Amino acid sequence: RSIAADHKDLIHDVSFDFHGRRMATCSSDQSVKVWDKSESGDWHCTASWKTHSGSVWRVTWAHPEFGQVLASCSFDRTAAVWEEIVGESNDKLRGQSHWVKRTTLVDSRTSVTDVKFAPKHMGLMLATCSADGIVRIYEAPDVMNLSQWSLQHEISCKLSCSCISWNPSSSRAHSPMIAVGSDDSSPNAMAKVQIFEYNENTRKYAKAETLMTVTDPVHDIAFAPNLGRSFHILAIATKDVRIFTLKPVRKELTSSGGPTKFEIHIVAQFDNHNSQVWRVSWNITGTVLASSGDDGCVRLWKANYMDNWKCTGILK
């Protein structure tokens, strides 16, 4: 059944962890609530305290490679990371200690709205996109020190202030790529072979491909996990009542001193909701995709035979 999140304001994002009995929530009342599932399937509140001074919009949890860490981005130009402690009581506003804070950065000095961590194969890295149009890339060099968060890169994806959406590639057998959406544009940045030059503040901009066919602002964007497939899949949620899905197939053999060209291909475009989409999540292996709009219905799309998107269900 449904349950209350104990939030006075409206909820923004609600991401989960990687176990099965943990769920983080962030609203506009400057509170970060953490849910915990029991053995009977009931969701119970574990910890809930204040993390920032503004309205929290982005909330994502890290993997278990560096502990139980959780990142949060608010509108107060701050991106602090909380750490779960097992030596504290539940629902005591003390089990989540602040490790560091990303408030003095030049790229994250505006209203942040998108913050998602990277995979565990490239270390404890995370990306953030504020209203200044510059995407900040923070990565910790020391695994034992959770407060030593240094700026890795600072690329400018946009220029104005609109809806930001960060989405990193979860494929471990591919190159380091991440999708960033802003206003009607939806580019896809990819790491080159000049990591030493990019980490020494010398690389300006970096773009590989861009997802077009968008006549409105993108509300949500997520990349599906390429489990077994040689191509990538990234679903977009625009405000023009159209759920597009990109298909990129360009990751091949990396030659010594060679290059590659990222190609874009539109798979399908759904418009059964006839409303502006707000959320667009995927599956753990890239076999199911959801799309929620303003009509009050969640349609679950699945891959057919010839790379076609078919709605296998519609929950309301």
Binding site: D13, F16, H19, Q276, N283, I284, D294, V298, L300
Partner: peptide
């Protein structure tokens, strides 16, 4: 029309779609 957000979680619990 209210902005409905359905976070289809599958990496942790696939039988818990919030």
């Amino acid at each position: 029309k209210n902005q409905m957000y359905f976070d289809w979680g599958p990496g942790e619990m696939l039988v818990c779609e919030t």
